Amino acid sequence: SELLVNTKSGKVMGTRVPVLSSHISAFLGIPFAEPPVGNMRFRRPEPKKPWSGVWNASTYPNNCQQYVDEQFPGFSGSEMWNPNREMSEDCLYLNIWVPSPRPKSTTVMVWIYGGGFYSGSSTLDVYNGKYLAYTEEVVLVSLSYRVGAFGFLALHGSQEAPGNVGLLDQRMALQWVHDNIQFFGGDPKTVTIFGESAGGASVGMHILSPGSRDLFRRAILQSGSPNCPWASVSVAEGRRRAVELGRNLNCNLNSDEELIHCLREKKPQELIDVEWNVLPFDSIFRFSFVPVIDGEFFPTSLESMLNSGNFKKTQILLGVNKDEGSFFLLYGAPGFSKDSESKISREDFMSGVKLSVPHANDLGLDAVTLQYTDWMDDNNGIKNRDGLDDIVGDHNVICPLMHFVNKYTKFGNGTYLYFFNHRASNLVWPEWMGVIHGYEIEFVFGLPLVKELNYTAEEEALSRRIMHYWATFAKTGNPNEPSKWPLFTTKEQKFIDLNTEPMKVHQRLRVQMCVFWNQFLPKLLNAT
Amino acid sequence: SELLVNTKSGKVMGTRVPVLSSHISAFLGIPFAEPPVGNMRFRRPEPKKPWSGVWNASTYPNNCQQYVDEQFPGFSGSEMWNPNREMSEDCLYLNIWVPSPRPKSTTVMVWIYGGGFYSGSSTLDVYNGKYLAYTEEVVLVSLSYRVGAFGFLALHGSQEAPGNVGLLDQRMALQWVHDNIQFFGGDPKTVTIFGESAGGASVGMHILSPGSRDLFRRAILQSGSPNCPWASVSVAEGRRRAVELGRNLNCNLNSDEELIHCLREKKPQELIDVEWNVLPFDSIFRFSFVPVIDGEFFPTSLESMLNSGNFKKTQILLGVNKDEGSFFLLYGAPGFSKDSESKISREDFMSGVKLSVPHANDLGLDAVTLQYTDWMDDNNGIKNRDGLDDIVGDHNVICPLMHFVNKYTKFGNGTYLYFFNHRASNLVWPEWMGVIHGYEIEFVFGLPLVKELNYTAEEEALSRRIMHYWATFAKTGNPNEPSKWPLFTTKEQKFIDLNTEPMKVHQRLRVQMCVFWNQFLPKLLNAT
Ligand SMILES: [NH3+]CCCCCCCCNc1c2c([nH+]c3ccccc13)CCCC2
Ligand SMILES: [NH3+]CCCCCCCCNc1c2c([nH+]c3ccccc13)CCCC2
Ligand SMILES: *[C@@H]1O[C@H](CO)[C@@H](O)[C@H](O)[C@H]1NC(C)=O
Ligand SMILES: *[C@@H]1O[C@H](CO)[C@@H](O)[C@H](O)[C@H]1NC(C)=O
Ligand SMILES: *[C@@H]1O[C@H](CO)[C@@H](O)[C@H](O)[C@H]1NC(C)=O
Ligand SMILES: *[C@@H]1O[C@H](CO)[C@@H](O)[C@H](O)[C@H]1NC(C)=O
């Protein structure tokens, strides 16, 4: 049978699923690591023991323990990101969509979910791999990894909670893909890892990390890069946050063994309930437990690695959305709300910039404010709102990605850059949020192909263009079929827009603002 | 006779002069102070001893000892500013143009020449007061004052060279106007002092200085304000430069008495020959001997005086030209030259910004560079040139003037602001210099009224508009005759353009750049 596959870990049994009036197979919930429960919580992942018999892979696995969004109860805009499965610490599984008939050796795509390293699931409807697997004839894999304290509590020096285990979870799933995708018709020498937000940052972290490089061929990063200001912390800050977490749960804080033992005795929801209480500043776009620059997974600082070319050299395709910051201001900056146009006053503008560049002094805040204020119309509420929005996006996503792409291209073997600015005809979010963080995903996964979802015909056309660029790129190292998406070069720095209009090529994506965030502000903060 | 006037200092005899096919009287070369020669060099001015007999006032007086421009020998563009009279330390005279028939009690205008406090003359053809006196029926006075070391050598604490004597020269001439203009038909209660560049800075200094305020009614400032970065120095820097001047002339430097005695024994050209050797930095738009914040003429710092409203409250009319900085880059920045378009490279751009903000550290230079570079076209030579030009103008003239006008309007009784951007049809300077520092003067003095000078008919029309605005303002406190030049207010901050086109009203003249130069850069330099 086409739904039975024998892997190096045991036999697994899939299920047939319908897609655009046809069908393909799906192997949902395959385990790739032993459940990280009990004394295993916080430890690096251990490889799944093989099993005799047949693993039932017909339904989605549980989602990892995580904080759940409740701002807009029942609002699809936000519920679509919450776990749609029971949560459990037993959550290290992967899902595989396989074209029918089963391929022999075709292109493989592995999706790594985003969610600021504190949330996320591989089972969300927007991550359904069936449309992409089917339309492009690729074997689509989506892995999972521990988030929050479970995946990133870091007490450097300890082997019980070394930090970065969530990344190691991902690596293990990738080790599994490399070792077994052939039995599902996948070509292990042609796997592309792609992810969005923390997923994009993760992809870049596997490009950097020596122990991950050999496990994949190419990479795609959506709205995220490894050097993002919110994606990593030092071992010290990591230690400081683990201790503070312990202090919140009334733990014994005399030794790492004492802290970890206490944290391991707490129920999942107990750690989640106080997780946010450990951030060092009042901030927007900052998360508690994230990857650490430990000297192991990351041999040295990210910047020196990027500067010395100490990373995997291959092709990469990546990009950003127009209004990456809107959602973060909606959730945490005063003056913004889901049901108004959110015109912001000067005072709220200013308190918003403070919230956005948490690590800046006064001189630094003035610099940012000056850089984003139209001084001959300072009380224009639409302008204050939009200016604040660009600040969040530029600082947290765009400029960090631009710095990564410029450093990468100096040593890489091919770069393709995009700027996704199509505002979906069926968006349920207020118009002021524009092209939101996370909303290019639905096009990458092909939702506009299903009529019931209500997209326009041009939007469906856009999704097919994107799906085919991503798949053609994963398969060849070039999104183009032999209108050309130009290669981004250190000299020309070209990129394309990605919407329903005829492709336009541009150059130096947000240079003006990014020279400010990548060169001036750091130098200014380092001297004061 | 109409050419004879009896003053409190003695009788004086004028000469009749032709103007636009008519005639008026002129009293040229009237002394208002004893010659500041010998042991008097560097001392405050002493009032002229009255004379019996008749003073021959039919010819222009000598010009004060000063550095003479020789960049473009015989080039009118630059020669028009050099002294057109023999130079001499005996130079404290004033010139009066009187309408014919002699008025009874009409509006008085006193012109104070510019020239960076190191040069200038009251006898230049562009300062000929006959056209203005005649056309507007005002008694036009032009004074003179010691420049260079002669007028501003400052060894604070000493009474032999206290500093600011050049300003005191001006005050004395104003004291004279106040005491004697009535005999020439002038209304001593209706005198307006107006000046350009250092002259404009001087006008503002008389508004600030308690001992000068009662001597005039209103004020006009052209391309200059008292708080300009090049218009004053501290007593320390002043002292430091006097000593360095002495060290250049091989003087004995053991005491003020020793230094001054030596400096007084040197010939005028000896001090002029080494005058530039004392600037503390490699700079553009900086001059050796300028006014000092001494605690006497200026009771406290200029900024605190402006902040506390410690100044003369009256009406003021003032403004700037579009390309104030061009001439300074022509004369001292690498890459600029009189006969090319001066497209500048990035390197020359950068060395130009260093030269322009002499007192800045590295962080400061980066800030300026970032603020003035179009980062998606950084190698555009026209852009680098123009960006550099605005930097000089914004920092040295425009933003300092905007800061002065905003502080002044908070306490004043009426402000009128202009932006002069007409590029004269007969300009002999290369087109890249635009509307040059000093080129609104010819319109204020009416040169476009004389056909031989070759202006267009619209330019002549512009000059009459300007002459009448200035005169109507001096006479009433309002340039408008009862298209309206709006009053500049703290709230609206309106100003007008001044060219051959229909008046357009605008708001917040260069706010964007000026918030940078008046608030950000200072704060940034003060923290690093
Ligand atoms: N106490 C502060 C905690 C509140 C934070 C909870 C918000 C949940 C975040 N959920 C979202 C994600 C993404 N886009 C959006 C866009 C809009 C709203 C929510 C999200 C793209 C990447 C996956 C996650
Ligand atoms: N070693 C450096 C010294 C060279 C400096 C000498 C240049 C003489 C300045 N002469 C000028 C003045 C003004 N505008 C211009 C415009 C263009 C050129 C020269 C001048 C308006 C204010 C009066 C003086
Ligand atoms: C696989 O497990 C699911 C989980 O409930 C169950 O519904 C389904 O019938 C099972 N299929 C087989 C063949 O065991
Ligand atoms: C990628 O590598 C190949 C072989 O090493 C080289 O010939 C080609 O020019 C490279 N392409 C890019 C975009 O660097
Ligand atoms: C005034 O002095 C000038 C200076 O040379 C002379 O030419 C002129 O004739 C004199 N006029 C009288 C009346 O003394
Ligand atoms: C100037 O002063 C007069 C009288 O003190 C006052 O009535 C008038 O409003 C003032 N004008 C301005 C522009 O301040």
Side-chain angles (χ1 to χ4, degrees), chain A residues 1-38 40-48 50-85 87-188 190-256 258-295 297-409 411-450 452-490 492-503 505-528, chain B residues 1-38 40-48 50-85 87-188 190-256 258-295 297-409 411-450 452-490 492-503 505-528:
Chain A
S1 179
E2 181 173 40
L3 301 185
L4 172 53
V5 175
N6 184 40
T7 79
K8 299 174 176 167
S9 281
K11 289 197 207 184
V12 76
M13 176 67 172
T15 177
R16 170 146 236 216
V17 303
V19 204
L20 307 187
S21 72
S22 186
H23 310 91
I24 60 173
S25 340
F27 298 83
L28 315 182
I30 296 166
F32 60 78
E34 279 310 303
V37 303
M40 291 295 265
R41 165 187 298 175
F42 310 133
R43 267 185 211 164
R44 27 174 71 74
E46 230 60 71
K48 181 59 174 184
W51 58 81
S52 62
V54 178
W55 189 287
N56 189 341
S58 62
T59 53
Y60 275 141
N62 292 130
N63 299 137
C64 294
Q65 282 295 184
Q66 55 189 280
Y67 173 87
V68 176
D69 181 10
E70 291 184 286
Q71 282 285 191
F72 310 105
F75 181 57
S76 55
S78 57
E79 297 296 3
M80 66 181 274
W81 303 111
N82 279 324
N84 55 170
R85 287 277 136 171
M87 290 186 279
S88 170
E89 271 181 286
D90 180 349
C91 60
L92 297 192
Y93 304 78
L94 57 85
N95 310 296
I96 320 187
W97 281 271
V98 176
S100 186
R102 190 186 296 172
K104 294 311 170 188
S105 193
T106 190
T107 301
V108 178
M109 293 182 76
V110 181
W111 171 251
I112 307 187
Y113 63 65
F117 293 117
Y118 75 81
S119 65
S121 306
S122 71
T123 64
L124 305 180
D125 300 323
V126 272
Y127 302 148
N128 199 320
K130 80 185 190 178
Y131 308 112
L132 187 48
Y134 172 66
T135 306
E136 298 291 319
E137 289 165 292
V138 301
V139 165
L140 191 117
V141 179
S142 59
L143 45 73
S144 60
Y145 58 95
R146 278 171 287 172
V147 294
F150 309 98
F152 298 97
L153 184 78
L155 288 167
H156 188 58
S158 161
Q159 285 312 316
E160 293 304 313
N164 292 332
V165 307
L167 285 172
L168 288 179
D169 289 357
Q170 303 175 9
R171 177 187 289 167
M172 189 139 82
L174 291 176
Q175 179 58 69
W176 200 88
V177 166
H178 172 272
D179 293 336
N180 302 279
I181 210 60
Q182 68 198 80
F183 310 117
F184 296 82
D187 179 8
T190 305
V191 356
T192 294
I193 55 173
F194 71 131
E196 180 271 350
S197 203
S202 291
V203 161
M205 292 176 160
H206 288 297
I207 280 170
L208 284 160
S209 194
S212 286
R213 310 177 186 171
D214 309 349
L215 305 174
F216 61 94
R217 178 70 166 281
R218 302 191 240 282
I220 290 174
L221 301 80
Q222 300 166 210
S223 305
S225 72
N227 55 314
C228 283
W230 51 265
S232 63
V233 292
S234 60
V235 291
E237 176 58 11
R239 173 160 288 283
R240 194 227 110 218
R241 293 176 194 192
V243 172
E244 183 65 8
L245 182 68
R247 178 188 286 96
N248 258 268
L249 293 163
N250 327 114
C251 285
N252 183 306
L253 316 185
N254 288 158
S255 63
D256 291 351
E258 295 250 37
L259 175 47
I260 300 170
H261 175 273
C262 173
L263 294 178
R264 286 200 178 133
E265 227 44 62
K266 299 297 186 173
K267 309 226 76 70
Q269 196 53 39
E270 288 177 75
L271 274 40
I272 290 168
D273 274 352
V274 296
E275 168 178 351
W276 298 92
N277 301 348
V278 308
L279 289 171
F281 318 114
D282 190 0
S283 61
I284 216 60
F285 220 133
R286 287 302 182 271
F287 318 107
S288 295
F289 302 98
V290 302
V292 277
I293 305 309
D294 62 354
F297 196 102
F298 300 108
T300 66
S301 80
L302 298 180
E303 185 54 23
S304 52
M305 293 192 67
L306 288 171
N307 267 318
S308 59
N310 186 11
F311 48 78
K312 184 197 189 64
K313 282 86 166 193
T314 183
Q315 307 84 40
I316 59 165
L317 182 150
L318 76 178
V320 304
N321 296 356
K322 182 183 182 288
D323 309 289
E324 304 277 13
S326 66
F327 134 61
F328 300 85
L329 295 154
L330 172 67
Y331 282 67
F336 293 88
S337 60
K338 193 177 82 42
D339 306 332
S340 72
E341 275 192 296
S342 299
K343 291 174 199 177
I344 308 297
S345 65
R346 275 313 277 173
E347 293 84 301
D348 279 350
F349 175 79
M350 283 191 294
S351 69
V353 358
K354 175 54 161 54
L355 250 25
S356 302
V357 193
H359 60 294
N361 49 25
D362 266 47
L363 189 67
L365 300 163
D366 290 341
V368 168
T369 299
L370 167 108
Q371 196 73 3
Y372 282 91
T373 302
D374 179 342
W375 292 104
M376 56 196 333
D377 200 7
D378 61 286
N379 281 319
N380 181 329
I382 305 300
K383 272 168 180 173
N384 290 332
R385 182 197 68 200
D386 290 352
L388 197 36
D389 191 353
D390 288 327
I391 286 167
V392 181
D394 295 339
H395 172 61
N396 289 289
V397 174
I398 307 193
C399 296
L401 184 138
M402 290 315 305
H403 179 72
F404 174 72
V405 66
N406 275 295
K407 283 284 181 240
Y408 191 88
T409 295
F411 297 93
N413 185 236
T415 305
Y416 301 82
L417 181 64
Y418 72 77
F419 180 70
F420 179 86
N421 60 348
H422 180 62
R423 155 89 177 192
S425 71
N426 52 13
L427 246 230
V428 309
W429 291 101
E431 198 170 305
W432 70 260
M433 293 170 84
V435 186
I436 306 166
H437 190 60
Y439 286 70
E440 84 290 349
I441 295 171
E442 47 200 63
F443 286 84
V444 163
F445 278 85
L447 288 291
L449 294 219
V450 0
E452 310 71 276
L453 293 184
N454 299 160
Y455 288 82
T456 64
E458 21 283 299
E459 287 178 327
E460 138 150 50
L462 176 56
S463 183
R464 286 172 183 286
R465 271 245 299 316
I466 287 167
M467 285 194 285
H468 194 62
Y469 287 146
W470 267 221
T472 305
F473 168 79
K475 173 183 169 176
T476 75
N478 190 334
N480 299 293
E481 200 71 78
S483 305
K484 299 302 132 184
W485 183 335
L487 191 59
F488 167 102
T489 63
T490 10
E492 320 275 64
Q493 298 171 43
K494 309 178 177 192
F495 66 93
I496 66 164
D497 293 321
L498 226 42
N499 48 53
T500 51
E501 334 213 311
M503 185 200 274
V505 173
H506 305 286
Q507 278 175 288
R508 291 170 163 191
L509 169 56
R510 285 187 86 72
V511 233
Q512 203 66 35
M513 293 304 104
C514 292
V515 170
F516 167 83
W517 293 103
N518 298 331
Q519 284 140 291
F520 184 73
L521 191 58
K523 180 161 182 177
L524 154 25
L525 294 169
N526 192 68
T528 67
Chain B
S1 179
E2 181 173 40
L3 301 185
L4 172 53
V5 175
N6 184 40
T7 79
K8 299 174 176 167
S9 281
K11 289 197 207 184
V12 76
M13 176 67 172
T15 177
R16 170 146 236 216
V17 303
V19 204
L20 307 187
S21 72
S22 186
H23 310 91
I24 60 173
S25 340
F27 298 83
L28 315 182
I30 296 166
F32 60 78
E34 279 310 303
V37 303
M40 291 295 265
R41 165 187 298 175
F42 310 133
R43 267 185 211 164
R44 27 174 71 74
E46 230 60 71
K48 181 59 174 184
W51 58 81
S52 62
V54 178
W55 189 287
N56 189 341
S58 62
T59 53
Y60 275 141
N62 292 130
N63 299 137
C64 294
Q65 282 295 184
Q66 55 189 280
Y67 173 87
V68 176
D69 181 10
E70 291 184 286
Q71 282 285 191
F72 310 105
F75 181 57
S76 55
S78 57
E79 297 296 3
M80 66 181 274
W81 303 111
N82 279 324
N84 55 170
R85 287 277 136 171
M87 290 186 279
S88 170
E89 271 181 286
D90 180 349
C91 60
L92 297 192
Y93 304 78
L94 57 85
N95 310 296
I96 320 187
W97 281 271
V98 176
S100 186
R102 190 186 296 172
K104 294 311 170 188
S105 193
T106 190
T107 301
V108 178
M109 293 182 76
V110 181
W111 171 251
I112 307 187
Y113 63 65
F117 293 117
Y118 75 81
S119 65
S121 306
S122 71
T123 64
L124 305 180
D125 300 323
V126 272
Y127 302 148
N128 199 320
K130 80 185 190 178
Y131 308 112
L132 187 48
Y134 172 66
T135 306
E136 298 291 319
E137 289 165 292
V138 301
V139 165
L140 191 117
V141 179
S142 59
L143 45 73
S144 60
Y145 58 95
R146 278 171 287 172
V147 294
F150 309 98
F152 298 97
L153 184 78
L155 288 167
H156 188 58
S158 161
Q159 285 312 316
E160 293 304 313
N164 292 332
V165 307
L167 285 172
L168 288 179
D169 289 357
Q170 303 175 9
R171 177 187 289 167
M172 189 139 82
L174 291 176
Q175 179 58 69
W176 200 88
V177 166
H178 172 272
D179 293 336
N180 302 279
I181 210 60
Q182 68 198 80
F183 310 117
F184 296 82
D187 179 8
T190 305
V191 356
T192 294
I193 55 173
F194 71 131
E196 180 271 350
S197 203
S202 291
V203 161
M205 292 176 160
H206 288 297
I207 280 170
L208 284 160
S209 194
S212 286
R213 310 177 186 171
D214 309 349
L215 305 174
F216 61 94
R217 178 70 166 281
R218 302 191 240 282
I220 290 174
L221 301 80
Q222 300 166 210
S223 305
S225 72
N227 55 314
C228 283
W230 51 265
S232 63
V233 292
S234 60
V235 291
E237 176 57 11
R239 173 160 288 283
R240 194 227 110 218
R241 293 176 194 192
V243 172
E244 183 65 8
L245 182 68
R247 178 188 286 96
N248 258 268
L249 293 163
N250 327 114
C251 285
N252 183 306
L253 316 185
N254 288 158
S255 63
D256 291 351
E258 295 250 37
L259 175 47
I260 300 170
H261 175 273
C262 173
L263 294 178
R264 286 200 178 133
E265 227 44 62
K266 299 297 186 173
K267 309 226 76 70
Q269 196 53 39
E270 288 177 75
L271 274 40
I272 290 168
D273 274 352
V274 296
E275 168 178 351
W276 298 92
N277 301 348
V278 308
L279 289 171
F281 318 114
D282 190 0
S283 61
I284 216 60
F285 220 133
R286 287 302 182 271
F287 318 107
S288 295
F289 302 98
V290 302
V292 277
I293 306 309
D294 62 354
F297 196 102
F298 300 108
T300 66
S301 80
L302 298 180
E303 185 54 23
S304 52
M305 293 192 67
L306 288 171
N307 267 318
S308 59
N310 186 11
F311 48 78
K312 184 197 189 64
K313 282 86 166 193
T314 183
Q315 307 84 40
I316 59 165
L317 182 150
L318 76 178
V320 304
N321 296 356
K322 182 183 182 288
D323 309 289
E324 304 277 13
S326 66
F327 134 61
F328 300 85
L329 295 154
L330 172 67
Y331 282 67
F336 293 88
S337 60
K338 193 177 82 42
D339 306 332
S340 72
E341 275 192 296
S342 299
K343 291 174 199 177
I344 308 297
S345 65
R346 275 313 277 173
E347 293 84 301
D348 279 350
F349 175 79
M350 283 191 294
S351 69
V353 358
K354 175 54 161 54
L355 250 25
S356 302
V357 193
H359 60 294
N361 49 25
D362 266 47
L363 189 67
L365 300 163
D366 290 341
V368 168
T369 299
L370 167 108
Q371 196 73 3
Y372 282 91
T373 302
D374 179 342
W375 292 104
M376 56 196 333
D377 200 7
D378 61 286
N379 281 319
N380 181 329
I382 305 300
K383 272 168 180 173
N384 290 332
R385 182 197 68 200
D386 290 352
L388 197 36
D389 191 353
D390 288 327
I391 286 167
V392 181
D394 295 339
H395 172 61
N396 289 289
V397 174
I398 307 193
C399 296
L401 184 138
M402 290 315 305
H403 179 72
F404 174 72
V405 66
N406 275 295
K407 283 284 181 240
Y408 191 88
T409 295
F411 297 93
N413 185 236
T415 305
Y416 301 82
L417 181 64
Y418 72 77
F419 180 70
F420 179 86
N421 60 348
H422 180 62
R423 155 89 177 192
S425 71
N426 52 13
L427 246 230
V428 309
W429 291 101
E431 198 170 305
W432 70 260
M433 293 170 84
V435 186
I436 306 166
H437 190 60
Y439 286 70
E440 84 290 349
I441 295 171
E442 47 200 63
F443 286 84
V444 163
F445 278 85
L447 288 291
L449 294 219
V450 0
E452 310 71 276
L453 293 184
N454 299 160
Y455 288 82
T456 64
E458 21 283 299
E459 287 178 327
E460 138 150 50
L462 176 56
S463 183
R464 286 172 183 286
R465 271 245 299 316
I466 287 167
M467 285 194 285
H468 194 62
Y469 287 146
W470 267 221
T472 305
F473 168 79
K475 173 183 169 176
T476 75
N478 190 334
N480 299 293
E481 200 71 78
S483 305
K484 299 302 132 184
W485 183 335
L487 191 59
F488 167 102
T489 63
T490 10
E492 320 275 64
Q493 298 171 43
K494 309 178 177 192
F495 66 93
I496 66 164
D497 293 321
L498 226 42
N499 48 53
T500 51
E501 334 213 311
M503 185 200 274
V505 173
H506 305 286
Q507 278 175 288
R508 291 170 163 191
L509 169 56
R510 285 187 86 72
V511 233
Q512 203 66 35
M513 293 304 104
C514 292
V515 170
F516 167 83
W517 293 103
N518 298 331
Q519 284 140 291
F520 184 73
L521 191 58
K523 180 161 182 177
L524 154 25
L525 294 169
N526 192 68
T528 67

